[PDB]
Symmetry: C2
Amino acid sequence: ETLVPLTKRVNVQADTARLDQIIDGCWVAVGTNKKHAIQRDFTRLFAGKPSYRFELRKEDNTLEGYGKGETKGRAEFSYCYATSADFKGLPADAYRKAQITKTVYHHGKGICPQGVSRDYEFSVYIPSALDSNVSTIFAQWHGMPDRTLVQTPEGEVKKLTVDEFLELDKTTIFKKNTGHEKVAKLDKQGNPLKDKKGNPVYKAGKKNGWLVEQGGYPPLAFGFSGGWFYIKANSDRRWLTDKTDRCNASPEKTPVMKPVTSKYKSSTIAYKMPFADFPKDCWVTFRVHIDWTTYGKEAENIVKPGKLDVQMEYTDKKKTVKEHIVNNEVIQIGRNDDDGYYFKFGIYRVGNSTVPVCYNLAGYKEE
Amino acid sequence: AETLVPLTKRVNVQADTARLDQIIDGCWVAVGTNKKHAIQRDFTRLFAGKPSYRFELRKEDNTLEGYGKGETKGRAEFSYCYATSADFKGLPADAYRKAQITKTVYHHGKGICPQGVSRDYEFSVYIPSALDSNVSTIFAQWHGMPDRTLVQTPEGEVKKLTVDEFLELDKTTIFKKNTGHEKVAKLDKQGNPLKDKKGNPVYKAGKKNGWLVEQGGYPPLAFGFSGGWFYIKANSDRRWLTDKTDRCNASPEKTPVMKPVTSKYKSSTIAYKMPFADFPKDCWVTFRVHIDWTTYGKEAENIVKPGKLDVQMEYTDKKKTVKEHIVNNEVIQIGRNDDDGYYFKFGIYRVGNSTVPVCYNLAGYKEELE
Ligand SMILES: [Ca+2]
Ligand SMILES: [Ca+2]
């Protein structure tokens, strides 16, 4: 068993991870559960231990993108998840409410709070086989939207109690951030569907004007796009993220350290290099220090800017290379939410791409 | 040769920066009635080689309204939490103004212990033999920090608004404490509009309009005297919007120690008590307090983790130093379900609709941010 499929998947926002779903005592897996998607790899060791091999084939996009008719793919590890143990000592009804609000992971480990600096390390192994036109994020620092923060059809942004949000959810169903009239699904004969428990299968009817906070660009992403390796930092100071504000820097086009800005957002390419110059068939180790932008919540102001530092190290052609590729740069990075940020690595295939992706990741540490 | 030096400068900590000339010993501002006798630097009652602070509320010195109908209360206190001009240096131009309207100025200042963060405190009190046994006063308290854009509509919806949305509301609603009223302009006795120093209308509360905003509530921790008892009292409120009508408050007199009086959302615990007559008089009593705050789930309104209270008491009587572990590391509910945390005050807060005179000294404050 040179490669061992790891097919267990956790909906980290809406479910606790079972102990049997946890990988190496510190990870859970998200995205498509194909056997090939994620495998423990004993043929590509790092620091004397198995690495994780991630693979998305052409047909492996399972998710919908923002664009019309666009798709995306995901096979990732999350360092943030909650377990049964995390709910001990909370009210009995806490887990159920957490499922509905999608706040389960709020109760788990691996969250860097708002405003708290943290250092991170991880290593990546890019096969020579990897296509230069891949469109994939291989490591990202993800935010945690405020789950009872809503916008009414009339345009008022407000945060509700959990109980009030549960009331709203009786007649509104949210698809991502977008509210729709809640209805029950019919079969192809026009007869109501019942689920495994005998309940109606709820479905999104017409859009009803409601919004809830959901999604948004990741504060920090390492990836490849358009024949470029890139590191991109995003900031969003708006209390309720506006998903229609598509402030996103292009690795291809946007010059290094020249932020693309809207009223509320900023998107900075902190570093880039041609794909051809990225070392292949060797472990590349990144050491990342992050000082998050701080925000004023309902005031929507940036209190203090952030900072990013990145060192890159690898051994290639009988030479060890160490490059200070992000040299302690003042940068806007984070999201205006209550909760902070969590680390993921693997494959997140974006930009409406089905170009195959396969590489390995290992050696993660945060402190 | 100084004896007593009046400190009459007062700061509206929630709605104003403290001027440099209002700051006492580089670390305090004063709140409450500004009578000369209310607060004085006292060179006749030294503590650790330094002047203490003498606080005094006479019978006529209640200047505040209590919750109860026709009830009054009094205040002369120091706050360790306040904002200064320096705190707003380099901020957006309109930041201070919005902070004044929302009553969030002190959010930008020093002396805040964040939600969930443990902290140690120390202070000393000197109770004269003259102090009447039926005083009703809090001499040290740990105060919370309400969410200032958290409102309730006339229809009963609890919601937190953006600052901009709250500013819009504030155009036509004026809040008196937590209670919203139609905003109107005040007239003189002839029925002619008053103009302020800059020629603007003087705003006034008209009829109640159904709106509420978060304000007030019991202090998370209070040291005081009531009904002939010295007491330490811990309060917890897990409701997202504090309900002021929920009068969950323990009395030292009859409530047994460490047995909370509870509502659905609140708890009030007498952590310790002793008869007034047994409290040492005419000497400095030093308290060392360690606090672990209860943590709360914000809009979920649950208690995440309980808190803890430890209190040591030390003084010298006629013959020996006495040290008593009066609150021995007690698991306890203590805090408030708000975004912001807690700040220290000491002095006189005369509660329970009392006008019994109060005079004592306080000194020797330290918080070790640990
Ligand atoms: Ca947000
Ligand atoms: Ca509150």
